[PDB]
Each structure stands twice: as structure tokens, then as C-alpha cells.
Design an enzyme around this catalytic site. Structure first.
Site, short mmCIF file in Angstrom:
data_model
loop_
_atom_site.label_atom_id
_atom_site.label_comp_id
_atom_site.label_asym_id
_atom_site.label_seq_id
_atom_site.Cartn_x
_atom_site.Cartn_y
_atom_site.Cartn_z
N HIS A 1 -22.05 135.48 70.18
CA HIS A 1 -23.43 135.81 69.75
C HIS A 1 -24.34 134.62 69.41
O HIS A 1 -25.55 134.82 69.25
CB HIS A 1 -23.36 136.80 68.55
CG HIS A 1 -23.13 136.13 67.16
ND1 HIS A 1 -21.89 136.02 66.56
CD2 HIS A 1 -24.02 135.56 66.31
CE1 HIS A 1 -22.02 135.33 65.38
NE2 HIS A 1 -23.32 135.03 65.19
N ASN B 1 -25.45 115.13 57.02
CA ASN B 1 -26.80 115.63 56.83
C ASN B 1 -27.48 115.85 58.23
O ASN B 1 -27.65 114.89 59.04
CB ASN B 1 -27.60 114.61 56.05
CG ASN B 1 -28.99 115.15 55.66
OD1 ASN B 1 -29.71 115.76 56.49
ND2 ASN B 1 -29.33 114.93 54.38
N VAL C 1 -31.05 113.87 58.89
CA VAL C 1 -31.04 112.42 58.75
C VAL C 1 -30.03 111.80 59.72
O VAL C 1 -28.81 112.06 59.65
CB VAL C 1 -30.68 112.00 57.28
CG1 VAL C 1 -30.77 110.45 57.04
CG2 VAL C 1 -31.49 112.77 56.22
N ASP D 1 -15.97 138.06 70.24
CA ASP D 1 -17.14 137.17 69.90
C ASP D 1 -16.79 135.67 69.93
O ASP D 1 -16.36 135.03 68.92
CB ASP D 1 -17.71 137.55 68.50
CG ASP D 1 -19.08 136.93 68.18
OD1 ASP D 1 -19.66 136.25 69.06
OD2 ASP D 1 -19.43 136.78 66.99
N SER E 1 -18.94 133.07 53.98
CA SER E 1 -19.89 132.45 54.96
C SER E 1 -21.12 133.33 55.13
O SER E 1 -21.33 134.36 54.43
CB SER E 1 -19.15 132.19 56.26
OG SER E 1 -18.64 133.42 56.79
N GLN F 1 -25.47 133.41 57.21
CA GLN F 1 -26.28 133.23 58.38
C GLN F 1 -26.42 131.72 58.58
O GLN F 1 -26.68 130.98 57.59
CB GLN F 1 -27.72 133.78 58.15
CG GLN F 1 -27.60 135.26 57.69
CD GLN F 1 -28.11 135.38 56.25
OE1 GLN F 1 -27.88 136.43 55.60
NE2 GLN F 1 -29.10 134.56 55.97
N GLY F 2 -26.27 131.33 59.84
CA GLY F 2 -26.25 129.91 60.19
C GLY F 2 -24.88 129.30 60.28
O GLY F 2 -24.78 128.08 60.61
N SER G 1 -22.44 130.93 61.49
CA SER G 1 -21.87 131.66 62.70
C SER G 1 -21.41 130.71 63.82
O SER G 1 -22.12 129.70 64.05
CB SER G 1 -22.99 132.46 63.42
OG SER G 1 -23.17 133.76 62.76
N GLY G 2 -20.30 130.95 64.47
CA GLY G 2 -19.66 130.08 65.46
C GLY G 2 -18.79 128.97 64.89
O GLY G 2 -18.01 128.45 65.69
C1 LIG Z 1 -24.32 134.07 61.56
O1 LIG Z 1 -24.05 133.07 60.75
C2 LIG Z 1 -24.37 135.53 61.07
C3 LIG Z 1 -23.34 135.88 59.96
C4 LIG Z 1 -22.01 135.53 60.08
C5 LIG Z 1 -21.14 135.82 59.01
C6 LIG Z 1 -21.57 136.45 57.85
C7 LIG Z 1 -20.70 136.74 56.80
N1 LIG Z 1 -21.20 137.29 55.73
N2 LIG Z 1 -19.51 136.15 56.65
C8 LIG Z 1 -22.87 136.86 57.78
C9 LIG Z 1 -23.75 136.59 58.84
C10 LIG Z 1 -25.52 133.74 62.48
O2 LIG Z 1 -25.55 134.29 63.62
O3 LIG Z 1 -26.39 132.92 62.10
CA LIG Z 2 -27.20 113.31 60.70
#
Ligand SMILES: *[C@](O)(Cc1ccc(C(=N)N)cc1)C(=O)O
Ligand SMILES: [Ca+2]
Length: 223
Positions: free
Chosen positions: A40, A54, A57, A84, A172, A174-175, A177-178
């Protein structure tokens, strides 16, 4: 990452940032020319960023390499998030050292109870937004599959596992992910999905990498 700690620069040397103008998803370096991430996260126009701490930077250890090919799993289902997982080949091989290293793929699937390390540059709040610039870490156990399925009735397949705390506060987000879930020094999972972040009785859900090792290896040998 909500409720985690600041990992320390290049303490997590397999961790990559996927960039398309801005960080959008993490990933893990599995050899000098391949990255594994969440299907995804797929986009056109990825640049892989290695050696980061960072992300805003330039601190000295970075390698920025464009992807030459991306392969999403044959069976990825973007409505259920089943399978996924995606492979990204780099245009050139990375230069590997102590601060940029690959992670091993697993021989065995890890058990409920095992403590793992999850890392990313995702949101650090369970309500509202605040994205860190430096890499965040969380240690968390793998949950049992009963506990997982009881959290997410009808939703978990064989190619998922949950990890985290049913009590909430540490997950974890958003962000993130992967990016990697590493247990005993092998890649066990991929940050896949969740219901919100760090909520009570809504642990994170992670792609189960040990079910794909044959598919990864085959793919890499042929591409
Ligand atoms: C992901 O980071 C979406 C994501 C993944 C995992 C969780 C979780 N609560 N462990 C929430 C949301 C993205 O696509 O940015
Ligand atoms: Ca850097």
C-alpha cells in the site's frame, strides 16, 4: 511511532525512507540493491533514502538512490490488505558499512511472546498530528493469533500478525507504514495497518514476512 523513544542516529542501519518529494513510507534494506516495503505504499517516482536520521537535514551518512523497478505482490488485495508487501530495486547498489547495512530475512516464523523492534518517522500522537524529524523506535511483543483475531474479528489472515499492547499508548502510526519489525536480528514484519493508533484493544497489524521468503528470493534472483 507513538509511545517510543528516539533510536539514535544510524542505530537502525537497515531502515530506509521512501521519498517522492517528501517522506511517505519506510522500508528495509535486504541487500545492496533491494528494499522491501508495504504494497500500500506503492507510487511511481520513488527515491530511496538510506543512512538517514534526521530526514530534513543532511548530516553526512546519506545515500539517495532512485528505484529502477517496483514489484507489488501478485496477490495484493488493497481492500483487505492481504499480502501487503512490495519489492523495490535500486538503480545502483548501496555502499554497505556499520551505519548502512542489510537485514536478514528469517528462516522461521517468530512466535507470540517475542519482543521486536519497530521504527519509523511516522506520527507520534494518538490524537492529532506531530511528525518527528528523527527516527523513533518501539520495542513490542508479538501477540497471539487468538488475541489478534479477537481484536479484529473477520480481518486477520494467515499473512498477518499483531504486535503491540492491548492497553494502547504504544504503537506504530501513519507514516511508519512499510517499515521494519525486527525480532532477534531478522526481518519478521512490515508495518501494514491498524485502527487509528495506540488505541486500547486495537494493536498494530503487520505483514508476516516469513510467509514470503520464497517469493522474495525467487523474485530477486530473476530481476
Ligand atoms: C501507514 O503508516 C498507515 C498505518 C500503519 C499502521 C498503523 C498502526 N496503528 N499500527 C496505523 C496506520 C501509512 O500508510 O502511512
Ligand atoms: Ca538526513
Amino acid at each position: 511511532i507513538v509511545g517510543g523513544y528516539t533510536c539514535g542516529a544510524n542505530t537502525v542501519p537497515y531502515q530506509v525512507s521512501l521519498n517522492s518529494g517528501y517522506h511517505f513510507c519506510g522500508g528495509s534494506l535486504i541487500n545492496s540493491q533491494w528494499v522491501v516495503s508495504a504494497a500500500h505504499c506503492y507510487k511511481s517516482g520513488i527515491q530511496v533514502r538510506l543512512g538517514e536520521d534526521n530526514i530534513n537535514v543532511v548530516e553526512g551518512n546519506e545515500q539517495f538512490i532512485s528505484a529502477s523497478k517496483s514489484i507489488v505482490h501478485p496477490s495484493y488485495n488493497s481492500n483487505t490488505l492481504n499480502n501487503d508487501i512490495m519489492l523495490i530495486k535500486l538503480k545502483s547498489a548501496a555502499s554497505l558499512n556499520s551505519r548502512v547495512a542489510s537485514i536478514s530475512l528469517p528462516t522461521s516464523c517468530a512466535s507470540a511472546g517475542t519482543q521486536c523492534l519497530i521504527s519509523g518517522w511516522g506520527n507520534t500522537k494518538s490524537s492529532g498530528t506531530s511528525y518527528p524529524d528523527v527516527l523513533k523506535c518501539l520495542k513490542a511483543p508479538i501477540l497471539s493469533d487468538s488475541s489478534c483475531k479477537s481484536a479484529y474479528p473477520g480481518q486477520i489472515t494467515s499473512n498477518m500478525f499483531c504486535a503491540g499492547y492491548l492497553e494502547g499508548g504504544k504503537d506504530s502510526c501513519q507514516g511508519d507504514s512499510g517499515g521494519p519489525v525486527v525480532c532477534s536480528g531478522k526481518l519478521q514484519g512490515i508495518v501494514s495497518w491498524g485502527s487509528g493508533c495506540a488505541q486500547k484493544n486495537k494493536p498494530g497489524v503487520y505483514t508476516k514476512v516469513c510467509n514470503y521468503v520464497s517469493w522474495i528470493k525467487q523474485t530477486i534472483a530473476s530481476n
